[PDB]
Amino acid sequence: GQAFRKFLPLFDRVLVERSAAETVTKGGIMLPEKSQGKVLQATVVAVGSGSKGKGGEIQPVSVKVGDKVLLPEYGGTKVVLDDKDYFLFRDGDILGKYVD
Amino acid sequence: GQAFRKFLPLFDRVLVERSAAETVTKGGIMLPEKSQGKVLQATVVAVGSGSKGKGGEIQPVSVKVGDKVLLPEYGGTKVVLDDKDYFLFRDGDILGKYVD
Amino acid sequence: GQAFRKFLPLFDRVLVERSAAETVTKGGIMLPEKSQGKVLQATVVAVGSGSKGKGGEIQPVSVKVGDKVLLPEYGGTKVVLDDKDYFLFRDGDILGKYVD
Amino acid sequence: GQAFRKFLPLFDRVLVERSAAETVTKGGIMLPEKSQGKVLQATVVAVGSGSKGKGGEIQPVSVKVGDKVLLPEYGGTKVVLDDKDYFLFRDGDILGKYVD
Amino acid sequence: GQAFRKFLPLFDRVLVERSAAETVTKGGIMLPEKSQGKVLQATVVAVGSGSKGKGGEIQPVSVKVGDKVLLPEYGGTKVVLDDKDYFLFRDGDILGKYVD
Amino acid sequence: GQAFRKFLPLFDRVLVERSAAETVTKGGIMLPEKSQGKVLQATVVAVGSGSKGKGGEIQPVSVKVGDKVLLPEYGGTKVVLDDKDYFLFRDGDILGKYVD
Amino acid sequence: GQAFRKFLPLFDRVLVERSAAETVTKGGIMLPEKSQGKVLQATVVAVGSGSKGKGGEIQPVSVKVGDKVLLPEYGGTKVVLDDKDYFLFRDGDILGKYVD
Amino acid sequence: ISSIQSIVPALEIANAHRKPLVIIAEDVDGEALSTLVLNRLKVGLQVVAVKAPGFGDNRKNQLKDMAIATGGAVFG
């Protein structure tokens, strides 16, 4: 696994930060803060070593640090690092990535 | 797996788009919008690499990109890619294909 | 797997059509349509390729196309093919067959 | 598996018929009809081929056709064959056997 | 397996006979019948063949006929053999044994 | 396994004597009986043979007769041997051991 | 496993102590005791030998004694050792590690 | 004002300037009131809390009037 700000997730956990919420639309209409729900786009900032799927070896996490991912609606764990917000998921709970 | 519109599903997930809802019947009677429920016919636009069913090898999904499938009533996840709606299912939750 | 009306079920799914509801008794008494429940007798019209029960091989379904089978009371999925109703079950939900 | 009046149970299912309910006691006091509950004694009239307990072979059922068995109270499915009642159980739900 | 009064339990089931309820204390005070609950001491009267714990061999039960056992509070099945009461448990549900 | 007072637990069950409830504090303030909850400290008096974790061998328990253990809050079974209270747990419910 | 003040956790259990709750903020504002929730930061004081993941070998825990860990919100067991509070978790319930 | 996070940074600003603080709010109950009285009694933080006069829109108008008169801004 790869640590981030002196924090390393255990087993198959993945630490991400969500993308900033949209404050303004494409035209110029300012959006309100209470209306903006949780952003399901995120970038992976930390990964764990993995779990033991089979016998004699460990299965690595299938995302890398810096990958852009799509979060599910429920399943994140609140982590506060340096007074900034972070969310911890499992590997299997990640819906997909954005490849470039 | 095959990525669609800079988005790649993870594990055994399958990204599809549903077919357009029927606006007019065969006679010529225009249908209303709130009548038209979720269309269970879809085409596969993206697939994942697969899951690990057994030991030492990956197991691909059983559908291809561009294949016509029949969706279940419940089990889809909303994915918005540049304002066009898309739905994410598991491989085993797909009822069947329309072979031609 | 075996397809029917350009529909191929996936994994261990079986597509059947139910037998016609009885309209008149053996004595000659006409039966109402509302009283006639769902017919648990069916004929197999399509089969899937099967699942992977053990490692390294595919496990085919226990019924073949054309088998007369007895359906359970619950567990079927509606499939509309050419305006005619069909029902999708798992291979293990089939109670038995009428050998002849 | 062994079929009974052109009906073959699938996987590990067992078709039995219950013994007749006791109409009269040993002295001569005749019992009423609604008093008599479901008889838990049965004779096996049909068996299935079996399930796949392990890899490479199928596990046969543990009762034969003609065996006298003790049914549980819940877990039976009604089967109507030639206008007479029959009950379908799993192999593992049968409590025991009346050896003679 | 070991049969008792022409009854043979199936798989890993143990048929036991409960010890008689105590009707008088050591002082000499006669106890009432509503007070005496189900006696958790029993003797093993019938033994099933066993279940398949692993691949290629049968696994017998861990009690034998004549063993004095301690029953749990819930998990027994009513069996009537020659108008006398008997109770059917699983092998794994037996708490322990009174070795002498 | 090892028996205690002619009682042998089965499979992976551990019989423990609980430690006496404290009745007076370090100064001399005597505690009441209703206040004294169930003591979670215990000594192991009886040990079962074990369960079959893998194929071809039995897995012994991780406690011994004489070990000082920390009981969980819920999960004990009431055993009365020679008019004296005893409690039956599984191996996995034991939280830990007071090694000296 | 490693014992801590004569207490050894069993199987895959980790004994930790939580970090002290924050009494005063960085500005200098004294915080109240009721409003201070349970501290999710902990240091590992004791570990168990481990569980058995596969056949024929023990699987150790993934934290060591002295590791700084992030506790989950629910899942701790109260342990009182020398009138000092301690909490018992499973090895897989620990979210992550503050590596330095 | 009833939560910890809604009252601590204003108190930090007031404590970093050695100047008293007067809260005029709809109510100050819950943990915020406990924090206020704890910091007043123990270390001697100069602070006082007061409910907002007025019912309905009159309360909003009066709070806006007080904020304009003191050169502050109405929160929430």
Task: Give the C-alpha separation, D79 to H17, whole Å.
Answer: 87
Residue E69 C-beta-side C-alpha neighbours within 13 Å? 31
Q: Is A37 on the interface with B (CB under 8 A)?
A: no
Distance of alpha carbon H49 from alpha carbon H33, whole angstroms: 8
- Which of C7, C52, C55 has the CB atom closest to B96's CB atom? C7
Residues 6+ apart with CB under 8 A from A4: A15, A45, A46, A65, A81
Contacts 24+ apart (CB under 8 A), A47-50: A47/A1, A47/A2, A47/A9, A47/A14, A47/A15, A48/A1, A48/A8, A48/A9, A48/A10, A48/A11, A48/A12, A48/A13, A48/A14, A48/G96, A49/A1, A49/A10, A49/A11, A50/A1, A50/A11, A50/A12, A50/A91
| The 3-state secondary structure of chain E, one letter per residue | CECCCCCEECCCEEEEEECCCCCECCCCCECCCCCCCCCCEEEEEEECCCECCCCCCCECCCCCCCCEEECCCCCCEEEEECCEEEEEEEHHHCCEECCC
- Cα(D66)–Cα(D61) distance, integer angstroms: 13
Run of H or E including A79: strand A77-81
Q: What are phi and psi of G69, to 5 degrees?
A: -130, 160
- For residue F14, the surrounding DSSP H or E stretch is strand F13-18
CA distances from B43 to B5, B58, C13 (A): 15, 24, 20
**In whole angstroms, how far apart are CA G89 and each of A9, C18, G16?**
16, 54, 8
Length of chain B as a residue count: 100
Report yes or no: A56 at the G interface, CB cutoff 8 Å.
Answer: yes
Indicate the burial class of F18 (C-beta count within 10 angstroms; 0-12, 13-18, 19 or more): middle
Which string of DSSP letters, residue by residue, matches chain H? --SSTTTHHHHHHHHTTT--EEEEES---HHHHHHHHHHHHTT---EEEEEPPSSTHHHHHHHHHHHHHHT-----
Helix %, strand %, coil % of chain G (to 5): 5, 35, 60
Chains meeting G at 3+ CB pairs closer than 8 A? A, F, H
DSSP B1-57: ---SSS-EE-TTEEEEEEPPPP-B-SSSPBPPTTT-----EEEEEEE---B--SSSS
Distance (Å, whole) CA G57 – CA G54: 7
Interface partners of C (3+ CB pairs, < 8 Å)?
B, D
Q: Which of B11, B48, B79 sits opposite A70 (nearest CB)?
A: B79
Nearest to D97 by CA among E11, E89, E67, E50: E11
Count Cβ atoms within 10 A of the Cβ of residue G32 and give its class: 0-12 exposed, 13-18 middle, 19 or more buried.
middle
Contact G70, G40 (CB under 8 A): yes
Is F37 an 8 Å CB contact of chain E? no
Resolution reached, in Å? 2.1
What CA–CA distance (Å, rounded) separates E41 from E73? Answer: 11
Rounded distance between C-alpha atoms, residue C54 and residue C39, angstroms: 34
Q: Please answer whether residues A13 and G92 qualify as being in contact, where contact means their C-beta atoms are separated by less than 8 angstroms.
A: no
Gaps in chain G (C–N > 2.5 Å) come after which residues?
none
Question: What backbone phi and psi angles, to 5 degrees, belong to B98?
Answer: -115, 90
Q: At what angle do helices H30-41 and H8-15 cross, to 10 degrees?
A: 20
Span between the terminal Cα atoms of chain H, in Å:
10
N-to-C CA span, chain B: 23
What tokens appear for E60 in the block? Answer: 């017998």
> Which residue out of F4, F6, F10 would a mutagenesis test of the E interface target, given it has the greatest number of E Cβ atoms within 10 Å?
F10
* Residue H6 Cα, gap to closest chain G Cα (Å): 13
Interface test with H, best of G29, G30, G34 (most H CBs within 10 A): G29
Sequence-separated contacts (24+) of C76-81 with Cβ below 8 Å:
C77/B72, C77/B95, C79/B70, C79/B95, C79/B96, C79/C7, C79/C15, C81/C4, C81/C5, C81/C7
Give CA–CA dist G63/C7, Å, rounded: 53
Cβ neighbours of B9 (radius 10 Å): 29
CA-to-CA separations, F43 to C13, D44, F39, F63, G21, in angstroms, rounded:
55, 52, 11, 10, 35
């009159």: which residue's tokens? H58
Neighbours of chain F (3+ CB pairs under 8 A): E, G
CA distances (Å), origin F62, targets F48, F99, G6, G15: 11, 13, 17, 18
* DSSP calls for G37-85: ----EEEEEEE---B--STTS-B--S--TT-EEE--SS--EEEEETTEE
For chains D and G, tell me whether 3 or more CB atom pairs sit within 8 A of each other.
no
Cβ atoms C65, C47 nearer than 8 A: yes
**What span, in angstroms and rounded, lies between the C-alpha atoms of E86 and E15?**
7
Cβ separation E99–F3 shorter than 8 A: yes
Sign of the torsion angle spanned by Cα atoms A3, A7, A9, A10: positive
- Map residue B60 onto helix, strand or coil: coil
Q: How many whole angstroms separate alpha carbon E87 and alpha carbon E70?
A: 13
Residues of E in Cβ contact (< 8 Å) with D16: none
Q: How far apart are CA B23 and CA B29, in angstroms?
A: 9
DSSP string, A44-70: EEEE---EEEETTEEEPPSS-TT-EEE
**Beta partners for B90?**
B13
Mutate to test the interface with E, among F2, F4, F5, F7 (most CBs of E within 10 A): F7
